[PDB]
Amino acid sequence: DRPFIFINSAMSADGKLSTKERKQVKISGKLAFERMDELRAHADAIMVGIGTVLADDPSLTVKSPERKAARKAAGKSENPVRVVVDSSARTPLNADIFKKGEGLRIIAVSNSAPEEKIRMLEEKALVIKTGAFRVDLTELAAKLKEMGINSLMVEGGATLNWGMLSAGLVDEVYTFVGNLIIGGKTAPTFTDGEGFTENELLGLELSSAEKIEDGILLKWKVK
Amino acid sequence: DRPFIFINSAMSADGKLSTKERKQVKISGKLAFERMDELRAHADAIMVGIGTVLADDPSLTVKSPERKAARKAAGKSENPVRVVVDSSARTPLNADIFKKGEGLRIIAVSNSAPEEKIRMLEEKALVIKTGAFRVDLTELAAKLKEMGINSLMVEGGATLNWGMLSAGLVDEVYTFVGNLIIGGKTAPTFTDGEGFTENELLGLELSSAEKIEDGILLKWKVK
Ligand SMILES: NC(=O)c1ccc[n+]([C@@H]2O[C@H](COP(=O)([O-])OP(=O)(O)OC[C@H]3O[C@@H](n4cnc5c(N)ncnc54)[C@H](OP(=O)(O)O)[C@@H]3O)[C@@H](O)[C@H]2O)c1
Ligand SMILES: NC(=O)c1ccc[n+]([C@@H]2O[C@H](COP(=O)([O-])OP(=O)(O)OC[C@H]3O[C@@H](n4cnc5c(N)ncnc54)[C@H](OP(=O)(O)O)[C@@H]3O)[C@@H](O)[C@H]2O)c1
């Protein structure tokens, strides 16, 4: 069992999350950010892969003071729980996640992560250890549920999106499709990793499509 | 100068044209095929990369007898011109393109293609030679225009889509987004090749979005 899980990502018209240089580029405008901010404020937790933390160093904070005050007035942290999937415990001790905002941090690591680096992280985050050499996402999802995380927003990363989807852990997939072509066989897509074969394709159902600023927001139910 | 050029492709919700095994899978239903068939019947020419011919061996024919009869009654071939971008002249002499339907075939090759294989193709197609080691798409587009091809449908292939887009030859991009996740860092996307850097991103404008069967058809104007 697990929380309700949805992926929320912005991709170019050709399906890329960023350039081959893994440089993050303007895919969306203000209205799309507000929609993302609102989703963050609503979720119990936000999850991202270590690849995203290293490449972009995001805070994963709710930006609107009002949305933060509202969470606050509901007796919750100003920010939801912030989870990094990080097998080898590479999350830097001065990552922006640890610098900005109140709220719990969780680092999910594997049993093969450096025992001394864990200890350093345990000073500023909760560390959940799971899996042999890679985080066991199914197991992690179960523990997050048990901790009372009923809604989990995966802002992803190409490989983590794959991790979560191929493990059958996802309920819904939201893709803001921006008005640009990024290109490149090596640019990260909305779903990388190994890939499904013809015999394992994951079916979706379209729930909505909404033009927003210069792009379009598509939402699918998984299965 | 060049014909009016549009890319028409079907991709999974995560931007893939097919699986990592390069196996083609059901992305769309009947209505989407009818829309594709109508587009084929309307274009002067259809262009595909040699990777697609080798992987899928498509006929690139108009399937509807009525749409073929209508082209016919307008004094044209039942099928538009069928172009393969094929630097090394790998198009097989028994490819389905040569077996099915009337109409002109063109093979676009580079100046480094085997001189004897050209001759074999020239029996069943027109061969336009252009470029040193890879087909010069800009040059090709110019010759196709001169031949009176005013409308060119690129059904693509991941790498050819990149070729055409990065050469600035494309006016519009149509993507039927199907209700499935394919996944895989090595699965072909709507645009592979080298990829744009942050400084060379190609801007689009959304022209329409139309739910069709279980997917959604997005159309963009380039720039
Ligand atoms: N446009 C958007 O909305 C958006 C949002 C977020 C991110 N991004 C983009 O995503 C890009 C990076 O994506 P990415 O794939 O490199 O990084 P990622 O998906 O954020 O994280 C991937 C890493 O997670 C770790 N992991 C641990 N256990 C795993 C499991 N069971 N399954 C899958 N992964 C597991 C793996 O590394 P270890 O094994 O070393 O731990 C894996 O390489 C960035 O350039 C960023 O711009 C875009
Ligand atoms: N879902 C859909 O609507 C749809 C439609 C069509 C195709 N597809 C998929 O596309 C996949 C294959 O894509 P692909 O990238 O391998 O093949 P492709 O894009 O059809 O053709 C690529 C090849 O074109 C040749 N080419 C020659 N000059 C070029 C130039 N200037 N720029 C770019 N390419 C040039 C190159 O090989 P040489 O240098 O050897 O000539 C290149 O590798 C197939 O698996 C198929 O299922 C999907």
Automatic annotation (TrEMBL), chains A, B:
<feature type="binding site">
    <location>
        <position position="90"/>
    </location>
    <ligand>
        <name>NADP(+)</name>
    </ligand>
</feature>
<feature type="binding site">
    <location>
        <position position="158"/>
    </location>
    <ligand>
        <name>NADP(+)</name>
    </ligand>
</feature>
<keyword id="KW-0686">Riboflavin biosynthesis</keyword>
<feature type="binding site">
    <location>
        <position position="160"/>
    </location>
    <ligand>
        <name>NADP(+)</name>
    </ligand>
</feature>
<keyword id="KW-0560">Oxidoreductase</keyword>
<dbReference type="GO" id="GO:0008703">
    <property type="term" value="F:5-amino-6-(5-phosphoribosylamino)uracil reductase activity"/>
</dbReference>
<dbReference type="InterPro" id="IPR011549">
    <property type="entry name" value="RibD_C"/>
</dbReference>
<comment type="pathway">
    <text>Cofactor biosynthesis; riboflavin biosynthesis.</text>
</comment>
<dbReference type="InterPro" id="IPR024072">
    <property type="entry name" value="DHFR-like_dom_sf"/>
</dbReference>
<feature type="binding site">
    <location>
        <position position="49"/>
    </location>
    <ligand>
        <name>NADP(+)</name>
    </ligand>
</feature>
<dbReference type="InterPro" id="IPR006401">
    <property type="entry name" value="Rib_reduct_arc"/>
</dbReference>
<feature type="binding site">
    <location>
        <position position="10"/>
    </location>
    <ligand>
        <name>NADP(+)</name>
    </ligand>
</feature>
<feature type="binding site">
    <location>
        <position position="87"/>
    </location>
    <ligand>
        <name>NADP(+)</name>
    </ligand>
</feature>
<feature type="domain" description="Bacterial bifunctional deaminase-reductase C-terminal">
    <location>
        <begin position="3"/>
        <end position="218"/>
    </location>
</feature>
<feature type="binding site">
    <location>
        <position position="52"/>
    </location>
    <ligand>
        <name>NADP(+)</name>
    </ligand>
</feature>
<feature type="binding site">
    <location>
        <position position="134"/>
    </location>
    <ligand>
        <name>NADP(+)</name>
    </ligand>
</feature>
<keyword id="KW-0547">Nucleotide-binding</keyword>
<dbReference type="GO" id="GO:0009231">
    <property type="term" value="P:riboflavin biosynthetic process"/>
</dbReference>
<feature type="binding site">
    <location>
        <position position="56"/>
    </location>
    <ligand>
        <name>NADP(+)</name>
    </ligand>
</feature>
<feature type="binding site">
    <location>
        <position position="22"/>
    </location>
    <ligand>
        <name>NADP(+)</name>
    </ligand>
</feature>
<dbReference type="InterPro" id="IPR050765">
    <property type="entry name" value="Riboflavin_Biosynth_HTPR"/>
</dbReference>
<comment type="subunit">
    <text>Homodimer.</text>
</comment>
<dbReference type="GO" id="GO:0050661">
    <property type="term" value="F:NADP binding"/>
</dbReference>
<dbReference type="Pfam" id="PF01872">
    <property type="entry name" value="RibD_C"/>
</dbReference>
<feature type="binding site">
    <location>
        <position position="17"/>
    </location>
    <ligand>
        <name>NADP(+)</name>
    </ligand>
</feature>
<feature type="binding site">
    <location>
        <position position="135"/>
    </location>
    <ligand>
        <name>NADP(+)</name>
    </ligand>
</feature>
<dbReference type="InterPro" id="IPR002734">
    <property type="entry name" value="RibDG_C"/>
</dbReference>
<feature type="binding site">
    <location>
        <position position="18"/>
    </location>
    <ligand>
        <name>NADP(+)</name>
    </ligand>
</feature>
<comment type="similarity">
    <text>Belongs to the HTP reductase family.</text>
</comment>
<feature type="binding site">
    <location>
        <position position="159"/>
    </location>
    <ligand>
        <name>NADP(+)</name>
    </ligand>
</feature>
<protein>
    <recommendedName>
        <fullName>2,5-diamino-6-(ribosylamino)-4(3H)-pyrimidinone 5'-phosphate reductase</fullName>
        <ecNumber>1.1.1.302</ecNumber>
    </recommendedName>
</protein>
<keyword id="KW-0521">NADP</keyword>
<feature type="binding site">
    <location>
        <position position="51"/>
    </location>
    <ligand>
        <name>NADP(+)</name>
    </ligand>
</feature>
